[PDB]
């Protein structure tokens, strides 16, 4: 059910602030696959410091064996969004209700993603 799943390590933060009361964009580089990622995260509700390691997963649906549109107990930062731009080292542009995500990796790693589809974002900081 999970299409893409890899361990990511953050590198730097765009605001580099603790109590800025603003959405923070993170830059995390994948291990092994070595895929650069941009993601907007809220630090106040989901703290994330530099050097931390977190896992990331993407699934079309949260149900088991079909039923598109029970993985909630495993992860803790589930999001929902759609992929609108796929043109690039291919990269993906997924917006989770205005929160842009840029997953830049290799053309072979990202091959089973269609245009204008709904996908989730499963995250856990170990």
């Amino acid at each position: 059910i999970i299409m893409f799943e890899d361990i990511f390590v953050v590198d730097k933060l765009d605001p580099d602030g603790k109590k800025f009361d603003k959405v923070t964009r993170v830059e995390a580089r994948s291990h092994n696959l070595e895929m650069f990622m941009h993601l907007d995260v809220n630090t106040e509700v989901y703290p994330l410091a530099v050097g931390d390691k977190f896992t990331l997963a993407m699934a079309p649906t949260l149900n088991l064996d079909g039923t598109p549109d029970t993985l909630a107990d495993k992860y803790e930062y589930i999001m929902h969004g759609k992929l609108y731009k796929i043109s690039e080292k291919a990269e993906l542009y997924v917006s989770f209700g205005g929160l842009l995500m840029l997953l830049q990796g290799d053309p072979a790693h990202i091959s089973h993603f269609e245009l204008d589809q709904r996908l989730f974002l499963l995250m856990r900081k170990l």
Binding site: D16, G17, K18
Partner: protein, 1052 residues
């Protein structure tokens, strides 16, 4: 970890330096921050987003880095990120042990032969800092309030010694620093965002000697009086060439040796008070300046008393032998006790003269001595005052070029920035004005040549009762007609090139042929810039004294102020003729002399040619294949004798006779004949080094020849005539489509030939010309000279970077694989407006111009910047940046003619260099252009008889130790594998030194030939003696304990 300054990534814009300092001291240890600087875009009210902080101890820096890595630094909801910095805020060593405060500093020299030292001036309470990373030692001396900085590098010192001042051998209370060069001298000159923990809000500018008695400029050694230190030896052990021995010294009252004159290191003339010769005194001064004998060791009464009355030749021999001593001599008296006409002929034969060369530094002056060099025209009619001529060059302490920051440092005073002249500027002005006094002489400024202007060199002549400097100046010509400062200097210094003396022609038979001018598109284009006309009889007369068999069709000549190349013709009226656009200045003499007649050398491809030819459509495969075949034929030259002759006949000299060339065609195996095999190996190594340093492609289908014009008017715009000699490759296979076998030795070309020069930075210089064959043109008999049409829209030299027909070389090549489809218009050749004064030259503005030539001299950096920008940005030589760089280069070239500074912008600096450069200290980036591919390919490829023999060997080893050579190959070939700190940065000085040593070895060979001719004077007996010499030198058992030289018998 090398430095201690840490750059903070992001800081709030509303904070001040005090708040950040308090935060750092709260998180870290108390008072652990030395310097904190926040850069500001504006003057004092707009700080930047980052800041740089300097820590006292590396442990504090490591702790701060650890805290930053854990994101434990939070100052006003900002996470401080720490990164390494480029340079320290203050050049202060991290180790507190190296910091020495309140110590005694004194200067002096080894005055006595024994273990004695002399103190001239002593300073107390000085600050000494040792910078291991910067490889320099700083001395802070406070004198009359303002402090001065003395900078000594690790290369400045040659040996480190430790001594004592209390008188106890066990204790160490002193340190000796023997200096080879002079130390740099600085001076201190006269806040919200800069803490700095101290009063470091000033700047350092280079200055001259600040001592009243000028003790620094006359002292070659430094002594550091410091307290006894148990671990001080470990700190002092870091200095290069440290001796682990204990030495004792005593103080000698040497306050008498104090000179208040500008030239400090010269001896006093009033002490002698006799008829001492000038040559011996000059040699003694040269010895004192060299690190051989100290000042006091040669100022004693006994030495001058002994050297006063003796044989002059023996005195010169012993003086030069003492100069050739490998080490420093302490007792000259013992050495000299244990040791015990032609100039005119040399000038008339090979123009051999002994010219004194002097180096002027901000600290002292170095006299090299009477070095042999090629004679110029000014000394032909003034050969009696051979010793009065002296070459003076203004260099730095390391004998290098003076940096732009050392003269006229910029400072913002008022609304506009105005440069401020340093003390070195005034020192140079005073030296030029008052002059240099050496013994019973006073040299005066005569003039400086164009080549010397670019090397900061100038001629000086000692005034005499017979002829003075002004007498020579007025004898050369009248220069009051020129109202331009630069033009007058150029015309006065242009008559100093090497030339061969010929017959004298009066001013009765001179023609005034009118010229031709074409004005199109509102632009003045002149075809005849320096062209001339010559007859056959004049060529025959001028070729008789030069030993030239073939009569060239063109040769550069200058006489009576005129300058330009002249061409032959079959319809001449009389011997000589002249045009109108050739008179530079009026002169009282019309001596004829010729510099260059013809050189049919094979063409070479420089970096700019490939850079400008990489956009018309030429691929990288062609150049790669050419480099591959070049390296293949170079590597095969060692074990194959057939390729050696072909290479020697197609690389340097189309028709050259030499001992190596003759033996290459017919010789033994490469394994045998070590004298030839090692020469071939060193030649291959030199070729590889030259290829690594710069691109030089050997193309056999092209030559380098000058061009002229014929009074025919048949050729149109775009039609020229190409004719050159036939080389080995041409003779082997003369059947070609574009090659016409007009004669056995001369072959015509009908292919597409382009014209290129050495300096080229514009894509429009490539002008494809179609060569044609005409019977009428061949009837005139033109050889080794391309023919330019008289009529056309614009002259060919104008399209060639706005050149002139002044005997300049032109690159020609009858290649067929080039791409002529793309054509680009040339750039404008219009120069700056000339500057004319309202008054005659008072010999002061010329000095101002000469000194200001060093300032804003960006000629050598424009080419490098253009190459870097071309390699980085694709589609090179097409953007406006390349056009701007070409315009700036043209203006900088024109700076020697007209006083128009180049004005190099700051934003145009490359700040990055490719792999194929010698700037190891500067950052290196991997280049992916054609030059990068070529460099990678090169890198991959790379990865009675007894007495004469003894005399010759002694002379050769004396020359080797005088020029620093350690092996026969580097002195015979003139190429030195080892370089100094100043011989590697520039190539003009190295080329001049190579020419001088080549002249010296040629003189030695001529003397050997004379000795051989006088020894025997019998043909068969001479052959027998040569065979006997070869047999003796070939036998290994005949070698003595000393180094036997095998280069003596090889004379032909």
């Amino acid at each position: 970890t090398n430095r201690s300054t840490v750059k903070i990534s992001n800081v709030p814009q509303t904070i001040v330096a005090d708040e950040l300092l308090r935060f750092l001291e709260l998180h870290l240890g108390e008072d652990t921050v030395f310097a904190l600087e926040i850069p500001t875009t504006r003057d004092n009210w707009k700080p930047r987003d980052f800041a740089r902080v300097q820590f006292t101890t590396l442990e504090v820096k490591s702790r701060a880095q650890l805290l930053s890595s854990q994101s434990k630094l939070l100052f006003k909801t900002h996470n401080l990120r720490l990164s390494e910095a480029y340079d320290d805020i203050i050049p202060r060593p991290v180790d507190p042990r190296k910091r020495l405060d309140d110590i005694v500093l004194t200067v002096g020299f080894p005055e006595s032969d024994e273990k004695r030292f002399c103190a001239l001036e002593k300073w107390d309470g000085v600050r000494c800092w040792i910078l291991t990373e910067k490889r320099r030692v700083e001395f802070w001396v406070w004198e009359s309030g303002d402090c001065y900085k003395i900078e000594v590098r690790f290369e400045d010192i040659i040996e480190t010694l430790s001594c004592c001042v209390n008188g106890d051998a066990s204790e160490i209370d002193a340190f000796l620093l023997k200096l080879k060069y002079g130390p740099k001298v600085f001076k201190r000159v006269t806040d919200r965002y800069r803490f700095c923990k101290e009063d470091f809000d000033f700047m350092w500018i280079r200055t001259t000697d600040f001592s009243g008695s000028k003790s620094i400029g006359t002292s070659t050694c430094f002594c550091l009086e410091v307290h006894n230190g148990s671990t001080m030896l470990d700190i002092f052990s870091g200095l290069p060439y440290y001796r682990e021995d204990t030495l004792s010294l005593t103080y000698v009252d040497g306050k008498t040796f104090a000179s208040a004159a500008q030239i400090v290191p010269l001896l006093n003339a009033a002490i002698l008070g006799l008829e001492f010769p000038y040559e011996i005194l000059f040699q003694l001064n040269a010895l004192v300046h060299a690190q051989k004998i100290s000042l006091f060791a040669a100022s004693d009464m006994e030495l001058i008393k002994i050297l006063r009355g003796m044989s002059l030749e023996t005195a010169l021999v012993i003086l030069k032998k003492l100069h050739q001593q490998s080490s420093i001599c302490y007792d000259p008296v013992f050495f000299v006790k244990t040791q015990m006409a032609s100039a005119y002929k040399r000038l008339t034969e090979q123009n051999i003269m002994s010219c004194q060369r002097a180096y002027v530094t901000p600290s002292k002056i170095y006299l090299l001595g009477p070095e042999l060099e090629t004679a110029n025209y000014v000394v032909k009619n003034f050969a009696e005052h051979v010793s009065d001529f002296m070459r003076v060059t203004f260099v730095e302490e390391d004998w290098s070029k003076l940096p732009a920051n050392a003269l006229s440092v910029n400072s913002k005073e008022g609304y506009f920035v105005k440069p401020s002249r340093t003390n070195i500027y005034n020192r140079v002005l005073s030296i030029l004005g008052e002059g240099i006094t050496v013994g019973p002489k006073r040299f005066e400024f005569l003039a400086f040549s164009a080549s010397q202007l670019r090397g900061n060199s100038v001629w000086m002549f000692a005034s005499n009762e017979k002829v003075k400097a002004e007498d020579i100046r007025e004898w050369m010509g009248c220069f009051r007609k020129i109202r331009s400062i630069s033009k007058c200097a150029a015309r006065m210094g242009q008559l100093f090139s090497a030339s061969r003396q010929t017959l004298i022609v009066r001013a009765q038979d001179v023609e005034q042929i009118p010229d031709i001018e074409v004005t199109t598109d509102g632009a003045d284009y002149c075809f005849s810039d320096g062209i001339g006309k010559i007859s056959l009889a004049f060529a025959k007369q001028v070729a008789q004294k030069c030993g030239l068999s073939h009569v060239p069709s063109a040769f550069q000549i200058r006489y009576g102020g005129y300058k330009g190349v002249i061409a032959v013709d079959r319809s001449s009226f009389r011997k000589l003729s002249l045009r109108d656009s050739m008179l530079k200045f009026d002169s009282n003499n019309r001596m004829l002399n010729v510099t260059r007649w013809t050189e049919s050398m094979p063409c070479f491809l420089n970096r700019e040619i490939i850079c400008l030819l990489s956009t018309l459509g030429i691929e990288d495969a062609m150049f790669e294949a050419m480099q591959a075949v070049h390296l293949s034929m170079l590597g095969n030259m060692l074990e194959d004798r057939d390729a050696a002759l072909n290479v020697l006949q197609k690389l340097s000299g189309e028709n050259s006779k030499n001992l190596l060339v003759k033996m290459l065609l017919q010789g033994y195996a490469p394994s045998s004949e070590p004298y030839l095999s090692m020469m071939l190996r060193v030649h291959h190594e030199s070729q590889l080094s030259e290829l690594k340093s710069r691109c030089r492609i050997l193309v056999p289908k092209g030559r380098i020849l000058i061009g002229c014009m014929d009074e025919m008017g048949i050729l149109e715009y775009g039609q020229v005539y190409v004719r050159v000699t036939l080389t080995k490759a041409e003779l082997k296979s003369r059947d070609q489509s574009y090659f016409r076998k007009i004669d056995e030795e001369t072959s015509v070309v009908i292919g597409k030939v382009v014209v290129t020069k050495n300096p080229c930075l514009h894509p429009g210089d490539i002008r494809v010309l179609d060569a044609i064959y005409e019977v009428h043109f061949e009837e005139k008999g033109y050889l080794d000279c391309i023919i330019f049409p008289q009529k056309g829209e614009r002259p060919h030299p104008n399209e060639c970077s706005g050149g002139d027909l002044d005997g300049d070389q032109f690159f020609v090549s009858w290649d067929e694989k080039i791409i002529p489809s793309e054509m680009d218009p040339p750039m404008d050749y219009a120069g700056s407006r000339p500057r004319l004064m309202d008054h005659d030259v008072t010999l002061e503005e010329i000095h101002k111009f000469f000194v200001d030539y060093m300032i804003s001299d960006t000629l050598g950096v424009i080419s490098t910047a253009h190459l870097v920008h071309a390699d980085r940005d694709p589609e090179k030589a097409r953007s406006q940046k390349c056009l701007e760089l070409a315009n700036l280069h043209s203006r900088a070239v024109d700076f020697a003619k007209t006083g128009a500074p180049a004005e190099m912008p700051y934003a145009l600096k490359p700040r990055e260099f490719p792999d194929f450069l010698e700037r190891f200290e500067k950052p290196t980036y991997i280049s992916e252009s054609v030059f990068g591919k070529l460099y990678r390919a090169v890198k991959s490829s790379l990865a009675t008889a007894k007495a004469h023999r003894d005399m010759y060997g002694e002379k050769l080893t004396s020359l080797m130790i005088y020029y620093g050579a350690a092996n026969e190959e580097e002195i015979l070939t003139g190429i030195l594998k080892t370089k100094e700190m100043y011989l590697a940065r520039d190539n003009r000085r190295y080329g001049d030194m190579k020419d001088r040593i080549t002249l010296s070895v040629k003189d030695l060979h001529k003397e050997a030939m004379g000795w051989f001719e006088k020894s025997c004077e019998d043909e068969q007996q001479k052959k027998k003696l040569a065979s006997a010499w070869y047999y003796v030198t070939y036998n290994p058992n005949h070698r003595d304990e000393k180094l036997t030289f095998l280069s003596f018998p090889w004379i032909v």
